[PDB]
Design a protein around this ligand. Structure first.
Ligand code: CLA
Ligand code: CLA
Ligand code: CLA
Ligand code: CLA
Ligand code: CLA
Ligand code: CLA
Ligand code: CLA
Ligand code: CLA
Ligand code: CLA
Ligand SMILES: CC1=C(C/C=C(\C)CCC[C@H](C)CCC[C@H](C)CCCC(C)C)C(=O)c2ccccc2C1=O
Ligand code: SF4
Ligand code: SF4
Lengths: 74, 137, 65, 80, 74, 753, 46, 139
């Protein structure tokens, strides 16, 4: 029961996390208009999206290279 | 102070591994080094803790050694790339290595930590945001 | 802008947005996009030339001589 | 049917019309470009949505755009 | 916890950061990118933009959520 | 007069200037790189000679010169095997004790603990146990010492240099005309009588004069040092007379057609040598001698220059209605007329046929070498026997897929509608919907009546209803036709009655007639077929038919279909024709090869799994003094292979114990490669499941970071093309899966074989 | 011969020389000093 | 009715289906200077006659591919026409629409589905919510 309950709620958590970002993307296309959000904190995020995505790529690359590299070394 | 980690020479589990090890080049010297310098867990294998004020050089030496080499490679590539931007056909200098240019870039990259510092201070390290290709928002 | 000028593209949807091109010719007629600009980097279609209007360009370096 | 739109950045190179496999596009007189012609899409009911016209368009960004819409027998390319 | 727990947490960190990278990149690029500057006019879920401009398979923001489910499951 | 040699003199200067011009062979690539796609395109089009130029004569010259280069590569590889078997092997120790020494010809250095891979293979030697069967091949050839292997290694390097010089000479100095390459009759005559015929005759001479006397002494038990060198059997005729009395009367019986007196060394026994478990070398000598005569006779079949012979064009023009059999006249009044145009101009069409027949030859090699083991101490070397069958099965599958691939290339590029007007090729294309629809149906019928019956078995077994299963103890499916063939072939030799009286022993003991044991291990015994064998054979029929369906749909629809009628104009290799018409992804003939590779892998994986489990379960094993055989897996196949839970548990889970527990042992490399194959398979899945649109957009952000630090490259980074991403995915998928099976097979056989 | 020298500066050729040289340096480091580990580099042999 | 004689063809499985009799059908007619072999749009080879020819095709793309990539490009035939034939017998000529090939500019052709702006000036979908207007159709 303990194993089933932990796995059940963790997997549901993963699906809910995916859905939160999925409907975030739907918001950008359907509901976001730059005129009413000009200059605010939501607009600033879109303005440096390249820095956000590239740095997320760097963290992913660093973790993947060294975690896998240390596993196969062992 | 961490108590579950003890010197490997004092670990009974590590000693059992030392005697059972094969008598080859790969085990005679390395076990002697591990016993004197490493800390071993209950399993008898060396463990690397980051909670000791002492043996801080054992952490900083490999970290600094890598960061210098990695920065050396990066600075060599960066300086070489910026040198070929002034050429008429920069793409051909990326599939054909310009050896005199590469040697100049490598020689300067020895002092890359100093070069990068003046590069950042003079504002020549980064390009301005509005002078960089970007996608529509 | 004029022939030989160095310009910065301001068209948002252009592949060369905020990039630098070289003016090849300017059309004197009343066409919508008379300025022809050539670029060192090709776009995703392999094309390195495009037509722009005056308000979509920023002069950053006058032509030589 | 699919929707094909032509924007004012067209240079009248007729490449999109030549690439269309179902004769959706044709070249019409115009005054907005040096070629004195612009692409038109009078027969979008025959458009399959292959986007060959977009591939042939040299302008940046595209002067011709295809927006896939409601699917019909001929827009799905069905011989049956 | 010991060294074995150290490596698996960093593997979990790799999974969290990559799944976030796929989702965030899809959300922030949902409105458009250099490859497709007018993505917002095509909606959240569309197949592609054809083989032109090098090919645009899995370019929609829906496809990023599609790809992120694989990483979320992993 | 018609057949003659015409060449050009110095057609291409020998200069290294073009070495510094990458992509010179292509007009687009010659301009230089602008994006990273240029680099990939340079390697992808490197050997596509028909896109370098439209001149057929120039293309053919490139084919001829490149083939010499590949021959040089093979000679270097062959020289390596002989040299490593002469310098870093235990070949001499193995020859003394073939049944107690594991062959080994690879020795690793000791730097990072990898010397643990130097296994204790016996004979006072430490190294990696090889499974290529080189030692058994060399012993059958009469090689007894490492010096002879060393000489062969030197000869291999010399032939490699000669091959390399020939390619340069026949491209840069004397390049034959197009008409030279179009001599079908001359080429067939020379390659039948001169290549196959004279090679068989030459090897028959080596077997008779060298291999037979040396191996006869070896099986008699005399030591290596006491066996005279092979040339002594030629000089000292008395030595050959003692072993074979017929050699005392010279060549007189051969020239007087009294060949029956040669029966002492040209035998017709069949069966296996009891001492070694391989085929009788005297049997193979008569086999190759008979082949030499048959091939040489076949080499006088085509008319070259003296009026005598047959013409290719006349046969093909005659094979049409109403000149065919009454029920074969449906091929139409044109028939094979016009097919000669294909062989005049299409290199791809010939490559398609030849790759297919190399698949056929390699499949026959795999099947006929385990049931009739031709080398001494090969059958009882279970690691080598499994490796040889598996290797040549995989080679055949790749060759067959290549045949279908270049068949589709011919259709797109070389096919001319004017040459094929109502002929058989035109008619085949005109009822391709008949062919594909029937093939699709039979694939569905085979899938339901082969695999879904396994699922029926799994459900019945889980229900606790074994009586309702398809098994020998439930609802039986006896392969009566295959069982009947085994009885006919066994009774043919005397073990529909005695139809081959001259054969003493059964042609193969797999069909019946008895068991052969060599070193306390089974060499070959009858392979009984039951319900489990009925089910698994129809699994092979299902997987093969589907693989045919994928490839043959691509070839028949390469020019176009009802969806995209102008696919030929789009080319052989293109990603799609846009999202229109509902979506036209993977319509190209190349994508059918890409999909067919997966189905070939699926088909062949079950073939080598069927071989591995059945041979371990019912053939291989140890024999005690009483003649009782205990098999490697103890007869699991009959009851466990009828469900894929049994395949999952008793084959994959159970037999992976060796590879999964190989850490801290000499087999640990197989354990590492077992995980390595699993990694590459999962790695390939992102190239197959994703698209380049996502990756190009991701590269945009990364490029922004490099632009921010003034370190962006001039050669603009691009995501792999749609086709390139598919090629990477299938390449890593097949590599990962095959390597995983390779480690799984070899680790187990190196431990229990 | 000048074309051969230009070919030797090709990216695949130079990369192969660089990787081979680095692998050689790393390989000899394993031969001369096997078993080097974090917390052990640049320390005398006991 | 449409005049012309069909090319020599022994039959095939890529021809017309129920859709031809139920919904619509297409016919391509042309004139050739000689009798010669061409490729059928759905596989196989056919022989076009000396005089005027008439071919029945399931889809309009078959006629455009045959007339464009084969008749004009290979056989230098430029007088081909494509008709749409309905089951009730109504026939309309659809290619070329006005007697001039679409790739050649012709006077009198109106601008259809033209947007008087660059593609980057399309309004965001948020401003057109619940209005039923797509951004590319916005004025
Ligand atoms: C009896 C004559 C003869 C022989 C033996 C061959 C043999 C061969 N030809 Mg060939 N050919 C011949 C006549 C002959 N040809 C004629 C008359 C023509 C013109 C119509 C051609 C046109 C032709 C083409 C167009 C091509 C070949 C190719 C090949 C090779 C096929 C690959 C193979 O099976 O590897 C066999 C592997 C071997 C190691 C065989 C040995 C190779 C050497 C060269 C044989 C030397 C034999 C010689 C008599 C010396 C014997 C010494 C000793 C035994 C006494 C093979 C070496 C193909 C190839 O790969 O070209 C390089 C190819 O593309 N041939
Ligand atoms: C006698 C055998 C033979 C010959 C002469 C050819 C010749 C040709 N083939 Mg072909 N082919 C063959 C067998 C053969 N093939 C087989 C058996 C298959 C089935 C797999 C194919 C499948 C095939 C396809 C699908 C295509 C060709 C194409 C071509 C043409 C271009 C060659 C090319 O792209 O360079 C090869 C260039 C490469 C970069 C390939 C090398 C990469 C390989 C896959 C790596 C393999 C991994 C390695 C073995 C193991 C791991 C290595 C390690 C480092 C990890 C050329 C006419 C292409 C074409 O356009 O034809 C007109 C094409 O699209 N062939
Ligand atoms: C492996 C992940 C996992 C695991 C172990 C569990 C475990 C559990 N879930 Mg669960 N769940 C998960 C993922 C998981 N969940 C996800 C991702 C969803 C979203 C769809 C749900 C939705 C869900 C619901 C709606 C319910 C549960 C319930 C339960 C509990 C009883 C069922 C059981 O014995 O386990 C599950 C055992 C399994 C072997 C899981 C596979 C079951 C089938 C075969 C999966 C395929 C479904 C179907 C055949 C395909 C479509 C038709 C148990 C604590 C029940 C509960 O709360 O109990 C009162 C309940 O009503 N779950
Ligand atoms: C409270 C939670 C919640 C709510 C209210 C919504 C609501 C919505 N989502 Mg959403 N979503 C959620 C959670 C939620 N989602 C989560 C957790 C994820 C991550 C997996 C997503 C991922 C997601 C995507 C990727 C998309 C949406 C879309 C949508 C909108 C249209 C729904 C649709 O496509 O028609 C109804 C859809 C279905 C009925 C789907 C069929 C069922 C799927 C295939 C599951 C397979 C069935 C499975 C075997 C058994 C499930 C149980 C069975 C009883 C059904 C709608 C506003 C779509 C949208 O707005 O388009 C622009 C869209 O593209 N969502
Ligand atoms: C085993 C399977 C597997 C593996 C290893 C990866 C690995 C990776 N994926 Mg991935 N992916 C997979 C399956 C897999 N994926 C599947 C099935 C999907 C669903 C379609 C995805 C979807 C997906 C998305 C959507 C994204 C990734 C991303 C990434 C990268 C982030 C992790 C990282 O940087 O680590 C470090 C890198 C690695 C661990 C890769 C292996 C490096 C090797 C081992 C180095 C060896 C070098 C050696 C000399 C090579 C030998 C020579 C050879 C060339 C012949 C990484 C390259 C993200 C990315 O690109 O972020 C930057 C990203 O956005 N993937
Ligand atoms: C020329 C050297 C160079 C330099 C200074 C950088 C610098 C950077 N890269 Mg980068 N990169 C390079 C080459 C280089 N790259 C190459 C060749 C590739 C293709 C494999 C990549 C692929 C790449 C990705 C996918 C990502 C970066 C990222 C980054 C940023 C942080 C992470 C990092 O250092 O990369 C770590 C290094 C790598 C990921 C691989 C580079 C290793 C290559 C093989 C070394 C090549 C050396 C070169 C041949 C030297 C020749 C010089 C000679 C002629 C004198 C940083 C701005 C990340 C980013 O945007 O962060 C914000 C990111 O996500 N890079
Ligand atoms: C029917 C052909 C045939 C057969 C059955 C054999 C059989 C044998 N050879 Mg042999 N050989 C042959 C032809 C053949 N040879 C030819 C043509 C040459 C070169 C001229 C040689 C050269 C040779 C050497 C040098 C050696 C052997 C050896 C052997 C033995 C080891 C087993 C083996 O090679 O695999 C058996 C192979 C097969 C079952 C299949 C391969 C046969 C060919 C490739 C199939 C051709 C048919 C094709 C698929 C259809 C063509 C299309 C059609 C329209 C015509 C065995 C007795 C070895 C030995 O001494 O053993 C003790 C050895 O050292 N052979
Ligand atoms: C095709 C290759 C080949 C070659 C090079 C030789 C070469 C030789 N054979 Mg030989 N032989 C061959 C095939 C071959 N044979 C075959 C296929 C048979 C079976 C019919 C024989 C049967 C045979 C007999 C019976 C004898 C020779 C003998 C000889 C030697 C003297 C022959 C002479 O000059 O007259 C000579 C070394 C004679 C010899 O000196 O014995 C060692 C001898 O008595 N051979
Ligand atoms: C295990 C996974 C799996 C399965 C079951 C299938 C099944 C099928 N593939 Mg397929 N495929 C797969 C993986 C799989 N594929 C993968 C990974 C690839 C990538 C390479 C492909 C690539 C591929 C191609 C390229 C082709 C196929 C084809 C086929 C069909 C072959 C005809 C057949 O067997 O009909 C019988 C059907 C089955 C055996 C499926 C299982 C049925 C179960 C066991 C019984 C169900 C009982 C009952 C009906 C259930 C109803 C209950 C109700 C409540 C639903 C069939 C639908 C071919 C095709 O369509 O030919 C006609 C074809 O051309 N596939
Ligand atoms: C991951 C991925 C990419 C991204 C992959 C790219 C851009 C290719 C990258 C190749 C690299 C640059 C080759 C070199 C990698 C080596 C591991 C580097 C060795 C470095 C030494 C120092 C060790 C695609 O472009 C793509 C396109 C279409 C379908 C699927 C995919 C896909 O899955
Ligand atoms: S291809 Fe583009 S630029 Fe050329 S005519 Fe068509 S829409 Fe205008
Ligand atoms: S292959 Fe890619 S670009 Fe082509 S139709 Fe399919 S998804 Fe779109």
């Amino acid at each position: 029961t303990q194993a089933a309950l932990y796995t059940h709620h963790q997997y549901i958590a993963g699906f809910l996390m995916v859905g939160a970002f999925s409907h975030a993307g739907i918001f950008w296309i359907r509901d976001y208009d730059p005129e009413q959000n000009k200059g605010n904190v939501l607009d600033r995020m879109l303005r440096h999206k390249e820095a956000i995505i590239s740095h997320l790529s760097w963290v992913s690359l660093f973790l993947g290279f060294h975690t896998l590299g240390l596993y196969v070394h062992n | 102070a961490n108590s579950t980690l003890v010197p490997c020479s004092k670990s009974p589990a590590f000693q059992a591994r030392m005697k059972n090890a094969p008598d080859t080049y790969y085990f005679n010297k390395p076990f002697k080094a591990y016993a004197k310098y490493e800390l071993c867990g209950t399993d008898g294998l060396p463990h690397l803790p980051l909670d000791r004020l002492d043996r801080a050089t054992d952490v900083l030496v490999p970290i600094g050694l890598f960061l210098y080499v990695a920065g050396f490679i990066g600075w060599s590539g960066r300086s070489y790339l910026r040198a070929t931007k002034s050429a008429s056909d920069p793409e051909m200098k990326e599939i054909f290595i310009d050896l005199p240019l590469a040697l100049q870039s490598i020689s300067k990259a020895v002092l890359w930590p100093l070069l990068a510092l003046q590069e950042f201070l003079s504002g020549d390290l980064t390009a301005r945001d509005e002078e960089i290709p970007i996608s529509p928002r | 802008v004029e022939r030989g000028s160095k310009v910065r593209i301001l068209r948002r949807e252009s592949y060369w947005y905020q990039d630098v091109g070289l003016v090849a010719s300017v059309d004197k007629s009343g066409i919508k996009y008379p300025v022809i600009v050539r670029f060192d980097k090709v776009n995703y279609a392999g094309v390195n030339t495009n037509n722009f209007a005056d308000f979509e360009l920023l002069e950053i370096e006058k032509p030589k001589a | 049917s699919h929707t094909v739109k032509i924007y004012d950045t067209c240079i009248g190179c007729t490449q999109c019309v030549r690439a269309c496999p179902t004769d959706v596009l044709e070249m019409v007189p115009w005054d907005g470009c040096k070629a004195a012609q612009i692409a038109s899409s009078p027969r979008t009911e025959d458009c399959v949505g292959c986007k060959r016209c977009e591939t042939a368009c040299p302008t940046d960004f595209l002067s011709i755009r295809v927006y896939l819409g409601a699917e019909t027998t001929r827009s799905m390319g069905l011989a049956y | 916890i010991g060294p074995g727990d150290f490596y698996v947490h960093h593997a979990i960190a790799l999974g969290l950061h990559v799944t976030t990278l796929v989702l965030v990149k899809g959300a922030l690029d949902a409105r458009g990118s250099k490859l497709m500057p007018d993505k917002k006019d095509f909606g959240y879920a569309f197949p592609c933009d054809g083989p032109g401009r090098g090919g645009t398979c899995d370019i929609s923001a829906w496809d990023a959520s599609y790809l992120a489910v694989f990483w979320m499951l992993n | 007069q018609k057949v003659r040699v015409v060449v050009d003199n110095d057609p291409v200067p020998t200069s290294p200037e073009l070495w510094a011009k990458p992509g010179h062979f292509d007009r687009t690539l010659a301009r230089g790189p602008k994006t990273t796609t240029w680099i990939w395109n340079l390697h992808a089009n490197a050997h596509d000679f028909d896109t370098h130029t439209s001149d057929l004569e120039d293309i053919s010259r490139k084919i001829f010169a490149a083939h010499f280069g590949h021959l040089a590569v093979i000679f270097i590889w062959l020289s390596g095997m002989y040299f490593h078997g002469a310098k870093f092997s235990n070949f001499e120790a193995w020859m003394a004790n073939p049944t107690g020494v594991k062959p080994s010809a690879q020795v690793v250095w000791s730097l990072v603990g990898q010397d643990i891979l130097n296994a204790d293979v016996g004979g006072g030697f430490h190294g990696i146990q090889i499974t290529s069967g080189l030692f058994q091949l060399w012993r059958a050839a009469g090689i007894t010492n490492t010096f002879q292997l060393y000489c062969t290694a030197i000869g291999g390097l010399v032939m490699a240099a000669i091959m390399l010089f020939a390619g340069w000479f026949h491209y840069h100095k004397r390049a034959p005309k197009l008409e030279w390459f179009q001599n079908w009759e001359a080429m067939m005559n020379h390659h039948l009588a001169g290549l196959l015929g004279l090679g068989c005759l030459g090897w028959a001479g080596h077997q008779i004069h060298v291999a037979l006397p040396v191996n006869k002494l070896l099986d008699a038990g005399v030591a290596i040092k006491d066996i005279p060198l092979p040339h002594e059997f030629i000089l000292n005729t008395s030595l050959m007379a003692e072993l074979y009395p017929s050699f005392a009367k010279g060549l007189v019986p051969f020239f007087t057609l009294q060949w029956g007196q040669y029966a002492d060394f040209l035998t017709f026994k069949g069966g296996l040598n009891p001492v070694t478990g391989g085929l009788w070398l005297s049997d193979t000598a008569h086999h190759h001698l008979a082949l030499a005569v048959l091939f040489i006779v076949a080499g006088h079949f085509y008319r070259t220059n003296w009026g005598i012979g047959h013409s290719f064009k006349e046969m093909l023009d005659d094979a049409k209605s109403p000149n065919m059999l009454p029920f074969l006249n449906f091929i139409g009044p044109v028939g094979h007329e016009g097919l000669d145009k294909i062989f005049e101009t299409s290199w791809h069409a010939n490559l398609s046929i030849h790759l297919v027949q190399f698949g056929t030859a390699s499949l026959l090699v795999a099947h006929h070498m385990y049931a009739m083991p031709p080398y001494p101490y090969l059958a009882t070397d279970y690691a080598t026997a499994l490796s040889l069958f598996t290797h040549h099965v995989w080679i055949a599958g790749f060759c067959i897929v290549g045949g279908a691939a270049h068949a589709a290339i011919f259709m797109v590029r070389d096919y001319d509608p004017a040459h094929h007007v109502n002929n058989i090729l035109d008619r085949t294309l005109r009822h391709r919907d008949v062919i594909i629809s029937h093939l699709a149906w039979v694939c569905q019928f085979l899938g339901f009546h082969s695999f879904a019956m396994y699922c029926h078995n799994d459900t019945m077994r889980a229900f606790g209803r074994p009586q309702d299963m398809f098994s020998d103890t439930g609802i039986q499916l006896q392969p009566i036709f295959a069982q009947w063939i085994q009885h006919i072939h066994t009774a043919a030799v005397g073990a529909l009655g005695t139809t081959a009286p001259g054969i003493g022993a059964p042609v193969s003991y797999a069909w019946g007639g008895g068991m052969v044991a060599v070193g306390g291990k089974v060499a070959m015994m009858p392979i009984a077929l039951g319900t489990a064998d009925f089910l698994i054979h129809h699994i092979h029929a299902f997987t093969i038919h589907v693989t045919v369906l994928v490839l043959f749909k691509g070839v028949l629809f390469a020019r176009g279909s009802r969806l995209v009628p102008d696919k030929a104009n789009l080319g052989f290799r293109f990603p799609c024709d846009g999202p229109g018409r509902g979506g036209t992804c993977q319509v190209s003939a190349w994508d059918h090869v890409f999909l067919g590779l997966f189905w070939m892998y699926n088909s062949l994986s079950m073939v080598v799994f069927h071989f591995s489990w059945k041979m371990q379960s019912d053939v291989w094993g140890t024999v005690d003094s009483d003649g009782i055989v205990t098999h490697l897996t103890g007869g699991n196949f009959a009851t466990s292979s009828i469900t894929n839970n049994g395949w999952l548990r008793d084959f994959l889970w159970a037999q992976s114990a060796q590879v999964i527990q190989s850490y801290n042992s000499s087999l640990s490399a197989y354990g590492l490669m077992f995980l390595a194959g699993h990694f590459i398979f999962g790695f390939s899945l992102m190239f197959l499941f994703s698209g380049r649109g996502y990756w190009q957009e991701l590269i945009e952000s990364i490029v922004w970071a490099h632009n921010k630090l003034k370190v962006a490259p001039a050669i603009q980074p691009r995501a792999l093309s749609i086709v390139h991403g598919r090629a990477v995915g299938v390449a890593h998928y097949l590599l990962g899966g095959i390597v995983t099976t390779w480690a799984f097979f070899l680790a187990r056989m190196s431990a229990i074989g | 011969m000048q074309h051969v020298f230009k070919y030797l500066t090709l990216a695949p050729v130079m990369a192969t020389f660089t990787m081979v040289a680095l692998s050689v340096v790393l390989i000899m480091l394993q031969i001369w000093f096997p078993g080097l580990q974090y917390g052990t580099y640049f320390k005398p042999t006991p | 009715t449409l005049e012309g004689q069909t090319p020599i063809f022994g039959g095939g499985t890529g021809g017309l289906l129920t859709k031809a009799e139920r919904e619509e059908k297409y016919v391509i007619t042309w004139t050739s200077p000689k009798e010669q072999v061409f490729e059928m749009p759905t596989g196989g080879s056919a022989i076009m006659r000396q005089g005027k020819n008439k071919l029945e095709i399931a889809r309009k793309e078959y006629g455009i591919a045959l007339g464009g990539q084969q008749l004009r490009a290979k056989f230098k035939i430029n007088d081909y026409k494509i008709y749409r034939v309905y089951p009730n017998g109504e026939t309309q000529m659809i290619h070329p629409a006005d007697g001039v090939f679409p790739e050649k500019v012709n006077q009198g052709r109106p601008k259809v589905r033209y947007v008087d702006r660059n593609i980057g000036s399309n309004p965001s979908p948020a401003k057109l919510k619940f209005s039923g207007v797509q951004p590319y159709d916005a004025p």
